[PDB]
Each structure stands twice: as structure tokens, then as C-alpha cells.
Ligand binder design. Structure first.
Ligand code: HEM
Ligand SMILES: CCCCCC/C=C\CCCCCCCC(=O)O
Ligand SMILES: [Mg+2]
Length: 405
């Protein structure tokens, strides 16, 4: 069993071995199970074949009890999964992406009034609070100013736990029942009409969603699925910090952004998502015996798809370990070569329905940093680990001398 080695190597565990064995797949004992680990765009296509792969019983209990919730969308298959996935997709269309991006812009502009007076700020901490306030407001979830930071911390504790052991994992295990109880009473109040809800917002649509047989979700399950909207919006915090890091470490792109418009901002944001680590891999179970790439996949075998390694595959990407947003000028759009938030079709599998929200929030936040304020980046540890999952520049990205531009 290689699980401790996986903990040691993190994002590079699969890529180190696919390179060493000169193969796009290898066998390994991980998580107590027999696994095949695979990488590359062709492997991602096979992974998203839902006749060959299922997610039920692929999600380790420890992941359900920390980041995702028990028996939630991530572990569902078949028409029941697709049914629930349409609920998430309806909440993440461009009107929602635009609304969230606009709320973020308003928050960043409002933040300058305090940042200019305090001089020094930790971007990760500011982002967490703003995103939590914006996510709850857009969703219709009441949120008191005195609890913004606690709820944001609970959301991040769940994200930060998914690849951890020891105290960091325990933080996520403790935060999940707090968040679920908090949101569940909201669901219950909404269903009794004791909390005002609005058609087309996340609280309303999760509270009143009906399944294929016409029954509502259990209030706890509706709460879990609403957290599966609120938590990943706060998780955009990680990408916002990596975006600011890339700006600092590749300063030639700042004037490139200042001169240009949303096209350059979008190429920059896509390169942040491709280049920096966030989700290392995905798990599934072989649904039926099949053969691919001269390997027999036996029913019941667990499988890991390498997100990070595919995103740095030199067969797909020129100089894959350099940050070069211009690579997305005149590049073909494809569902399997660029998979930091999954691959394939979100309507037909488990691909992230939040990609558009992620991208527009990142673009709005990049615009703020480039056009709205000036700032310095003082001496600090900007190192981010490829072993620690998820990963973040250690300091959280400290900014100082902040001035209204
Ligand atoms: C912040 C950066 C984000 C990253 C790195 C990310 C990444 C991912 C990945 C890798 C998956 C699983 C894909 C698969 O299993 O095939 C996923 C699923 C999901 N994401 Fe995201 N995501 C992010 C943001 C968001 C946002 C902002 C939302 C909602 C507003 C969201 C909602 C979801 C949901 C509901 C699923 C489960 C979909 C399903 O099982 O069918 N995510 N995400
Ligand atoms: C058997 C190994 C399973 C894979 C372990 C990690 C699983 C999924 C990674 C997270 C997917 C969604 C992340 C978006 C952010 C969030 O939901 O908080
Ligand atoms: Mg229904």
C-alpha cells in the first residue's frame, strides 16, 4: 500500500509514476483498495464513460464526512444523479455568474475604504469573508456580520481537510456538522414559510427541489446540497490568491492586462486554473469489465484520474510547467485536455457545474487588483507545496501600502 507515499508526493504522485513507468496508467494499492491510476486526455475520456465508471462507493467515507457530505451529488450515478445535477446547473448559468461577479466587484470596491486605512492585508483572509458574504447573499441565506468569519472559516476548514490527516482533517470533520445544522434549520424554516425565499435562488431551489419520484429531499440532504454550492464559492479564495501570486511572479503580464480587456483577463484566469494545483485527482469505480490501452479493468476496481498531471501534460501543452496565458490565444477548446474542475460534459457526468462562476469571479477580482488599487508585496513566504493538498502560498499573500488608484 502506497497511501503514505501519496501523502508525501501529493500532486506529483501519479505523474512521477506515469513518467517512471512510461505509461499512462499503472496499478497501485491505495486507500486499502486496488487502484489503477491514469493520466492524460485519452484517460479522462474513458473515465467519463458512465457505462464503464460509477461514483457510488468510490468516495472514501473520510471525504464525505469532511468536504462533500454523505450521499450527496458527488457519489450519485444514473438518472438520479443527472436529475439532481440539473438543479445545480440551473443555479450556475451566466445570469448567476454575472450576478456573483458584480457582487464581488461591489465588495472589492467597498473594501478599499478599509484597506487604504489599515495598509496591510492577507488576501486569502479578505477573500474568504467577502466570498462567504457574497455567496450567502446571492443564495438567499441570512448571514449576520458577527458570524461571517466563523462561517467562512468553517467552509474553508472543510475544503482544506480533503487531502489531510491529523488535526487539519479533524477541523473539517468538526466544521461539517456545524454547517449542516445551521443550513438545515434554514431549509426547515423555508419550507414552513418562516424564512422568506425567492424563486430561482439557491436556498429556495434546494429547499423545494423534488426528486424523480416527486418527493422533496430530506431537510438534511437539502442542506448538504446547498452547502455544495456555498462551500466551493468560498473555495475560490485559493484561486484568487494564486492569481495574485502569478501577477507578482510574472509582472510583465500586469501591463499586458492594463492595456487589454476581458479577453486578456480570461486567458490569464484560464492559465491560473491550468497551472496551479488545487484538485489533484478524482476517484471512480469500474462498473463493468472492459479493456483499454492494453489493460483489463475489472469490475469493482478503483481508479484515479490525474487532474494535475493532465493539466501539465507536454503532449497537450507547450512548456507545461511555465505560466503563459498567451498559450490560450488561438487554442482549440476541448473537454478533456484542460480539466482542473473535471472533464467531459457537466450535463452527462460529474464535471464541475461551477466553472463559469469560478472564471467570472476570478476575472472580476483580477480586474480589481490590476485597475482599482496599487499595492506592495512585502517580504513573506510565497512558497506553495506540491505535497500539501489543497495548496496555498504559505503567507496567504500579504499586501501592504494599499492605495486607491
Ligand atoms: C473554487 C474552485 C473549484 C474547483 C477547483 C472545482 C473543482 C471541481 C471538481 C474537480 C469536481 C468533480 C468533477 C468530477 O467528479 O468529475 C467538481 C464538482 C462539483 N463542483 Fe466544483 N470546483 C470549484 C468551484 C465550484 C463552484 C464555485 C461551485 C458552485 C457554485 C461548484 C460546484 C460543484 C458541484 C455541485 C460539483 C459536483 C458535480 C457532480 O457531482 O455532478 N464548484 N468541482
Ligand atoms: C478516491 C479518491 C477521491 C478523490 C478525492 C478528492 C475528490 C474530489 C475533489 C474535490 C471536488 C470538488 C472541489 C470543489 C471545491 C469544493 O467543493 O469545496
Ligand atoms: Mg422536481
Amino acid at each position: 500500500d502506497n497511501s503514505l507515499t501519496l501523502l508525501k508526493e501529493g500532486y506529483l504522485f501519479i505523474k512521477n509514476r506515469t513518467e517512471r513507468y512510461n505509461s499512462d496508467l499503472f496499478q497501485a494499492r491505495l486507500l486499502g483498495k486496488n487502484f489503477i491510476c491514469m493520466t492524460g486526455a485519452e484517460a479522462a475520456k474513458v473515465f467519463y464513460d458512465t457505462d464503464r465508471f460509477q461514483r457510488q462507493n468510490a468516495l472514501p467515507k473520510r471525504v464525505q464526512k469532511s468536504i462533500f457530505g454523505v450521499n450527496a451529488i458527488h457519489g450519485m450515478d444514473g438518472s438520479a444523479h443527472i436529475h439532481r445535477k440539473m438543479l445545480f446547473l440551473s443555479l450556475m448559468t451566466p445570469p448567476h455568474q454575472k450576478r456573483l461577479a458584480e457582487l464581488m466587484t461591489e465588495e472589492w470596491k467597498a473594501a478599499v475604504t478599509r484597506w487604504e486605512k489599515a495598509d496591510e492585508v492577507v488576501l486569502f483572509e479578505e477573500a474568504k469573508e467577502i466570498l462567504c458574504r457574497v455567496a450567502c447573499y446571492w443564495a438567499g441565506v441570512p448571514l449576520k456580520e458577527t458570524e461571517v468569519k466563523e462561517r467562512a472559516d468553517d467552509f474553508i476548514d472543510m475544503v482544506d481537510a480533503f487531502g489531510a490527516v491529523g488535526p487539519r482533517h479533524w477541523k473539517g470533520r468538526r466544521a461539517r456538522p456545524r454547517a449542516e445544522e445551521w443550513i438545515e434549520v434554514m431549509i426547515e424554516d423555508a419550507r414552513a414559510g418562516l424564512l422568506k425565499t425567492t424563486s430561482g435562488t439557491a436556498l429556495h431551489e434546494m429547499a423545494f427541489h423534488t426528486q424523480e419520484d416527486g418527493s422533496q429531499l430530506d431537510s438534511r440532504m437539502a442542506a448538504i446540497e446547498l452547502i455544495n454550492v456555498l462551500r466551493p464559492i468560498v473555495a475560490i479564495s485559493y484561486f484568487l490568491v494564486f492569481s495574485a501570486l502569478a501577477l507578482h511572479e510574472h509582472p510583465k503580464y500586469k501591463e499586458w492586462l492594463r492595456s487589454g480587456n476581458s479577453r486578456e483577463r480570461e486567458m490569464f484566469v484560464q492559465e491560473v486554473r491550468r497551472y496551479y494545483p488545487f484538485i489533484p485527482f478524482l476517484g471512480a469505480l469500474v462498473k463493468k469489465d472492459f479493456v483499454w490501452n492494453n489493460c483489463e479493468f475489472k469490475k469493482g476496481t478503483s481508479v484515479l484520474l490525474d487532474l494535475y498531471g493532465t493539466n501539465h501534460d507536454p503532449r497537450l501543452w507547450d512548456h507545461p510547467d511555465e505560466f503563459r496565458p498567451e498559450r490560450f490565444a488561438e487554442r482549440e477548446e476541448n473537454l478533456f485536455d484542460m480539466i482542473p474542475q473535471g472533464g467531459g460534459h457537466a450535463e452527462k457526468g460529474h464535471r464541475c457545474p461551477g466553472e463559469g462562476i469560478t472564471i467570472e469571479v476570478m476575472k472580476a477580482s483580477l480586474d480589481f487588483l490590476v485597475h482599482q488599487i496599487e499595492y506592495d508585496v512585502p517580504e513573506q513566504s510565497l512558497h506553495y507545496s506540491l505535497a500539501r493538498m489543497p495548496s496555498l502560498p504559505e503567507s496567504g499573500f500579504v499586501m501592504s501600502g494599499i492605495r486607491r488608484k
